[PDB]
Write a protein that binds this ligand. Structure first.
Ligand SMILES: Cc1cc2nc3c(=O)[nH]c(=O)nc-3n(C[C@H](O)[C@H](O)[C@H](O)COP(=O)(O)O)c2cc1C
Ligand SMILES: CC(=O)[C@H]1CC[C@H]2[C@@H]3CCC4=CC(=O)CC[C@]4(C)[C@H]3CC[C@]12C
Length: 364
């Protein structure tokens, strides 16, 4: 019955009854205008409430933070009230839910920015990737990213404050935890990576400078709420949507994790590979990470149940977040526990659209 995946784990302020977590999954089904979570999104999360922990789809800390049409926010009264219904649904089913908070920075498009203006980043370099907009019929469509404007020095306190306010908002909205999105090429990662950061002020150059913004954010949100409410997702090894981690990625990663550990936060979520591939982590590196962080460590990235049991049993990580298996299997915990087959995935309905391919996938 898989030896440890179905055992409890204390995760900061809450207790997970198992180690099968639901990874954050952008599904781009919110209401526009307003970027408002929907009853349908509430149903989808409720279906998945047996997860050890649900991590929400990435959610905007501000309107500026928006980079995808259909991604929800957590900055407006309308958004807060909608999220309250979703977390109540999950709690009604005895689940736990964390909100993943992002600023997309240069992975964005001017047509969805305030005033229709260019999006912001550490430097004025195009992301050279695609984001998702909606066409005149409300259907998801790919679009090249807009070239960003470099944040001015005196704009950085505002960014930190947006993260702080969004965490305040998450508390009022009834989330159990927050997850800072410091991975996959979005704004915090844009500062972290030399490839996307050519600043010559104290937010660029050395690893200390590059990690300055994310650590400022971590301190602000710990002070706003509590360290045992804060998780962070990083992707510090490999390349993610054209953003790599520099020529000293392993040393820089360990620096960051040591700094994070100083804040005593609830967890560290390691996204190990991009959807395209990535070189696998070495056991030695996992050991170096493990010895530097004293909260929960969550592993993610094309994990199998077997891999998750291997590494939890090795004491290298405490939980695993599954993404696409959770899209297709609301009761993934029960399936894994019973070694039942999984529903087939339907990737064409991962983004945008409605119930089909969303609340679609049956339970046992
Ligand atoms: C449709 C889709 C949406 C995603 N959305 C997010 C997101 O909002 N935040 C994030 O950190 N990662 C995101 N990802 C990465 C997932 O959280 C997960 O780390 C990659 O799915 C995990 O692997 P697996 O799906 O093979 O289990 C997404 C991946 C897919 C396929
Ligand atoms: C190349 C393309 O279609 C884009 C449009 C939507 C984007 C996905 C949007 C959600 C997302 C958030 C993440 O944190 C990891 C990258 C992903 C998973 C994105 C990868 C690139 C995709 C799939």
């Amino acid at each position: 019955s898989a030896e440890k995946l179905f055992t409890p784990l204390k995760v900061g302020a809450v207790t997970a009854p198992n180690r099968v977590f639901m990874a954050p999954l952008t599904r781009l089904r919110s209401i526009e205008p307003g970027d408002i979570p929907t009853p349908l999104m509430g149903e989808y999360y409720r279906q998945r409430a047996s997860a050890g922990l649900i991590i929400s789809e990435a959610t905007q800390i501000s309107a500026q933070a928006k980079g995808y049409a259909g991604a929800p926010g957590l900055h407006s009264p309308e958004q807060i009230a909608a999220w309250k219904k979703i977390t109540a649904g999950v709690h009604a089913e005895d689940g736990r839910i964390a909100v993943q908070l992002w600023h997309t920075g240069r992975i964005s498009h001017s047509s969805i920015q305030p005033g229709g203006q260019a999006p912001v980043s550490a430097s004025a370099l195009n992301a050279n990737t695609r984001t998702s907009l909606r066409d005149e019929n409300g259907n998801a469509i790919r679009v090249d990213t807009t070239t960003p404007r470099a944040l001015e020095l005196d704009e950085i306190p505002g960014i930190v404050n947006d993260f702080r306010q969004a965490v305040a908002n998450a508390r009022e909205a009834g989330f159990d935890l927050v997850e800072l999105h410091s991975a996959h090429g979005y704004l915090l990662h844009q500062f972290l990576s030399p490839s996307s950061n050519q600043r010559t002020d104290q937010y660029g150059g050395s690893v200390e400078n590059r990690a300055r913004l994310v650590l400022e954010v971590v301190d602000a949100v710990c002070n706003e709420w509590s360290a045992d409410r804060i998780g962070i997702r990083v992707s510090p090894i490999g390349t993610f949507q054209n953003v790599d981690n520099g020529p000293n990625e392993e040393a820089d990663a360990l620096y960051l994790i040591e700094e994070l550990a100083k804040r005593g936060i609830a967890y560290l979520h390691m996204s190990e590979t991009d959807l395209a591939g990535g070189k696998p982590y070495s056991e030695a590196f996992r050991q170096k990470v493990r010895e530097r962080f004293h909260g929960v460590i969550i592993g993610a990235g094309a994990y199998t149940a077997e891999k998750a049991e291997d590494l939890i049993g090795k004491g290298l990580i405490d939980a695993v977040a599954f993404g696409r298996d959770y899209i297709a299997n609301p009761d993934l915990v029960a399936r894994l526990q019973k070694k039942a087959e999984l529903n087939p995935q339907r990737p064409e309905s991962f983004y945008g659209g409605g119930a089909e391919g969303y609340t679609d996938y049956p339970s046992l």
